[PDB]
A paper describes a structure:
Subsequent studies in [name], Xenopus, Zebrafish, and Drosophila confirmed the role of [name] as a myosin-specific chaperone, promoting the folding of the myosin ATPase domain as well as coordinating the assembly of thick filaments during muscle development. To better understand its myosin folding function, we established an orthogonal protein folding assay in insect cells, characterizing the interplay of the [name] muscle myosin MHC-B with its cognate chaperone [name]. Structural data of various functional mutants clarify the role of the distinct [name] domains in this process providing important mechanistic insight into its myosin folding activity.
In contrast, none of the ts-proteins shifted into the HMW fraction further confirming that the ts-mutants, present in a folded state, cannot interact with damaged myosin. Together, the cellular folding assay, the CD data and the SEC-based reconstitution analysis demonstrate that the ts-mutations L559S, G427E, E781K and L822F have a direct effect on the myosin-binding function of [name], abrogating the interaction with the heat-damaged myosin substrate. To address the structural basis of the impaired chaperone function of [name] ts-mutants L822F and G427E, and [name] ΔTPR, we analyzed the crystal structures of the three mutant proteins. The two [name] ts-mutants L822F and G427E crystallized in the form of a linear filament, having the same periodicity (85 Å), hydrophobic interface and overall domain organization as the previously characterized wt oligomer. However, when we compared the UCS domains of wt and ts [name], we noted two major differences. First, the ts UCS domains adopt different conformations, as most clearly seen for the C-terminal portion of the UCS domain that moves about 10–15 Å. Moreover, as revealed by the L822F structure, the entire UCS domain is able to move en-bloc towards the TPR/central domain backbone of the [name] molecule. A second difference of wt [name] and ts mutants comprises the dynamics of the UCS domain. In contrast, the two ts mutants crystallized exclusively in one state, even when testing a large number of crystals for an alternate crystal form. Likewise, the L822F ts mutation causes local changes inducing movement of the UCS domain towards the TPR/central backbone. As for the G427E mutant, the established inter-domain contacts reduce the conformational flexibility of the UCS domain, which seems to be a common property of the analyzed ts mutants.
Residue numbers in the entry: 7 to 38, 43 to 508, 524 to 605, 627 to 915, 923 to 938
The structure:
């Protein structure tokens, strides 16, 4: 339609929903030759309110190729270059915007900032250069006789580049940071955390898109080999943290290519995606070459699969539409299916036991990303080609045994990820004789793989029973094995369709033996016990043994993110965290939760949580929500990494698990110290979910905890207050603040709006003559049965009456002010009396007419009664105003 979309974007700006407006103007630019500058200007304003300053600068630079006399592009680019640290060109843009519109007050405020910033710019740059020179000679250029002081220099550079955009500019040092890091990575005799902290510094530095594309194209004048070096940096070392940090570097490369960020909820710009499309296809080709390269190790391959998972799918904030289609139609899907056919016992390229779930989540996300029925059909055609290619080589020879193994691995990875495609492949009647052949074999690995295939088949739907009718007794045969690798895989399935007491004892027997039984055994034991744990008797049975909980925690810390679904299902059922029997009672729920938290459930949760499964992270979020119910435990939950984990869960879980993670954060920070519980930049990113908890219409218990946590967060710094105002929270808080039969919600809303008055924009909106906010600030000071509302509103009345226009509006707009004032002057609570007399006193110091109105009123007798006996000094100050006038 190409024309109503900017109208919808303008309506989204007027609704103050700026990410929707950014997406709409990005959509409207895609349907275009003189309507483009309006789109770039309004999209620059939308990105500027979005804290996207690079994109605002880009859209203003593109909007000036049409008319260089454009005051909007100049002003918005001055703001964007201000927030990026380039104050000189910001000054020049704002100077040209001032000489083309000399009466705009916003440009005057911008010039008032930028002249003071340009007078001190050179000293700030040379001081920052001296700081990074000190820390960078002590970190990279070899002035250190100890490892931990080089570590301290690296942590200082990391905090400095995370503090400001100018800090990242100074640490970048026009591109000397990446030789200083690469000639440290290639030193194999250097410490792990040194290298990982250096790469964390580099990842923060590349968050800029221009520096990151510069970083991509600089290692070799041949483009694809520079791309290959950047993508193969993870193969330089075998440590997990190194591979994770290098994967974050490649994530930065993707985020600079498409101009996307899933952490910032930033859908990509297709103009800058098509602009450097060649770099995107080069990185995708190099990573899918890394999927099947046997010189690439296991965790590097898992990281590449996670990069495809996060980045390629356009339905999950990734690389836009047409790229995953190309990935399926070409040889990338077949590479994922070939990695799906792998086990550590039989692999062609290195594959760990965790690789299967990474492939399964990536394949499920890709099957979801094929949105139309034809592309889903092409997906099914390629998996049928791979299925038929495997099953045509399943001969009865020794060679065909490994193809039977590959076929079974393929189908298990199907049934753990894209479940319905797997169920469609199970209903082949050529498939179940292969299972009956490998189950009746002498090879124990084939017996185990048949057992885990037929437990992968057990779901709710009944058309899989076509195999399960022969699968369940065969499984009951395999439980009679004297091999534990077959016995636990047959114990799953027995636990999954259901005797139960006998099973639970068998799962406990496998799980308690920690040294002699490996994590491969205890994983399937934990999976079977997760299947059993829906019954509350076995819940109380698990909780009543402490050493079983210790064994589950040891399995979590040693197996890592391999037992996420199982342990998270255990923790969710034991905590009764699923929303809705004599033993699912809140005393018993509290007993189970306290026992879990007492023996390390939260470090187990943070140990298993390094996956991209939205469902398993939803389970972890529900577990942490049920953990954070109890007020004496939540400090230990904060101390055991719970706040950072829930801040990850509110970004990367399922859509209904984000809500549970946010309610968990609200519980954790309701009655806690926000400097300890949310230290530093964390207190920024906690503002985003908690405002989304504010539902005055739904009216749950999450609203009070969210108001208390935002009240605590609004007391630490002004940036928190501005971001609370930025997230459209003020009407949501005012809806609680207007409630009549809800005392404590109104009190918490008054406390939060009291702490938000120290932010000057909300202070100026409260004084402003549009609203009746001052009326409620005055009348809630005299609404006297609730001490806390009166204290908060009297404090706000004391603060808001050091503006004389607010004093005049309180006088002429609020009728029955003398009753309110004589009540808060005689007031029973000391804090309310003190702040109310402070407000009355600076009303009288504000004007002579208003002081003459007060002295000739009902308020004067109680003022002179207070002065003739802390709050007496404020009434004395008001009588000093009366003596002055």
């Amino acid at each position: 339609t190409a024309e109503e979309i900017r109208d919808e974007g303008n309506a989204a700006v007027k609704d103050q929903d700026y990410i929707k407006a950014d997406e709409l103007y990005t959509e409207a630019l895609q349907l275009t030759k003189a309507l483009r500058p309006v789109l770039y200007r309004n999209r620059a304003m939308a990105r500027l309110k979005r804290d996207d300053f690079e994109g605002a600068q880009s859209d203003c630079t593109k909007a000036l190729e049409f008319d260089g006399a454009d005051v909007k592009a100049l002003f918005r680019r001055s703001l964007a270059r201000e927030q990026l640290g380039n104050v000189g060109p910001a000054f020049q843009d704002a100077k040209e915007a001032l000489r083309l519109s000399p009466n705009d007050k916003g440009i005057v405020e911008v010039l008032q900032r930028l002249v003071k910033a340009n007078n001190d710019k050179i000293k700030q740059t040379t001081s920052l250069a001296n700081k990074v020179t000190d820390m960078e000679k002590l970190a990279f250029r070899g002035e250190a006789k100890d490892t931990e002081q080089k570590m301290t220099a690296l942590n200082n550079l990391l905090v400095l580049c995370r503090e400001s955009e100018s800090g990242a500019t100074g640490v970048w040092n026009q591109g000397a940071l990446v030789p200083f890091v690469l000639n440290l990575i290639n030193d194999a005799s250097e410490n792990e955390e040194v290298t990982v902290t250096a790469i964390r510094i580099l990842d923060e530095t590349i968050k800029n898109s221009v520096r990151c594309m510069k970083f991509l194209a600089m290692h070799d004048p041949d483009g694809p080999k520079s791309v290959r070096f950047v993508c193969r940096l993870m193969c330089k070392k075998s440590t997990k943290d190194f591979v994770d940090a290098t994967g974050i570097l490649v994530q930065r490369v993707f985020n600079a290519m498409a101009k996307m960020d899933r952490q910032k909820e930033m859908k990509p710009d297709p103009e800058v995606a098509e602009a450097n499309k060649i770099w995107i296809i080069r990185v995708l080709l190099e990573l899918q070459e890394m999927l099947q390269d046997p010189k690439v190790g296991a965790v590097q391959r898992e990281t590449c699969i996670d990069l495809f998972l996060k980045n390629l799918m356009h339905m999950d904030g990734g690389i836009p539409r047409g790229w995953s289609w190309k990935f399926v139609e070409e040889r990338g899907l077949l590479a994922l299916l070939d990695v799906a056919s792998q086990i550590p016992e039989l692999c062609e390229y290195p594959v760990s036991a965790e690789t299967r779930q990474h492939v399964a989540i990536c394949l499920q996300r890709l099957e979801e990303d094929m949105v139309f029925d034809t592309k889903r059909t092409i997906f099914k055609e390629k998996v049928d080609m791979f299925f038929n290619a495997l099953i045509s080589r399943c001969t009865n020879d020794d060679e065909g045994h490994k193809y039977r193994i590959k076929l079974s691995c393929f189908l298990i990875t199907m049934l753990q990820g894209p479940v319905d495609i797997g169920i469609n492949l199970i209903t082949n009647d050529q498939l179940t004789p292969i299972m009956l052949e490998m189950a009746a074999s002498q090879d124990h690995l084939m017996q185990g793989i048949a057992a885990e295939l037929i437990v992968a088949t057990v779901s709710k739907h009944e058309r899989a029973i076509n195999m399960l009718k022969v699968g369940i007794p065969v499984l009951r045969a395999l439980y009679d094995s004297e091999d534990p690798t077959v016995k636990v895989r047959a114990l799953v399935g027995l636990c999954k369709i259901g005797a139960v007491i006998s099973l639970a004892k068998t799962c406990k027997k496998f799980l308690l033996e920690t040294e002699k039984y490996s994590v491969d055994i205890r994983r399937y034991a934990c999976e079977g016990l997760s299947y059993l744990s829906l019954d509350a008797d076995v819940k109380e049975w698990i909780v009543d043994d402490s050493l079983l909980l210790k064994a589950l925690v040891l399995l979590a810390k040693k197996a890592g993110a391999l037992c996420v679904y199982t342990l998270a299902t255990i923790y969710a059922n034991l905590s009764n965290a699923f929303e809705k029997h004599p033993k699912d009672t809140e005393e018993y729920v509290e007993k189970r939760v306290r026992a879990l938290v007492e023996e390390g459930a939260v470090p187990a949760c943070v140990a298993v949580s390094k996956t991209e499964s939205k469902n398993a992270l939803e389970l972890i979020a529900r577990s942490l929500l049920a953990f954070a119910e109890y007020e004496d435990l939540r400090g230990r939950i904060i101390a055991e990494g719970g706040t950072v984990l829930c801040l990850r869960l509110t970004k990367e879980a399922s859509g209904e698990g984000k809500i549970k993670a946010g309610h968990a954060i609200a519980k954790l920070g309701a009655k806690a110290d926000p400097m300890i519980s949310f230290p530093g930049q964390r207190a920024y990113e906690v503002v985003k979910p908690l405002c989304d908890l504010l539902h005055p219409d739904v009216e749950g218990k999450a609203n009070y905890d969210s108001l208390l946590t935002l009240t605590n967060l609004a007391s630490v710094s002004d940036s928190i207050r501005g971001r609370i105002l930025k997230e459209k929270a003020i009407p949501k808080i005012e809806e609680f603040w207007f409630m009549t039969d809800h005392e404590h919600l109104r009190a918490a809303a008054a406390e939060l709006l009291l702490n938000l008055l120290f932010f000057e924009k909300f202070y100026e909106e409260t004084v402003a003559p549009g609203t009746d906010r001052l009326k409620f600030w005055v009348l809630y000071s005299a609404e006297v049965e609730e001490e806390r509302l009166s204290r908060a509103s009297a404090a706000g009345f004391a603060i808001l009456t050091e503006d004389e226009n607010a004093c005049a509006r309180i006088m002429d707009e609020i009728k029955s002010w003398p009753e309110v004032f004589k009540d808060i002057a005689m007031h029973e609570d000391a804090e309310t009396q003190r702040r109310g007399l402070m407000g009355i006193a600076n009303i009288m110091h504000s004007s002579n007419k208003l002081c003459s109105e007060i002295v000739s009123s009902e308020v004067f007798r109680v003022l002179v009664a207070v002065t003739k006996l802390g709050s007496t000094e404020q009434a004395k100050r008001g009588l000093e105003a009366a003596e002055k006038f």
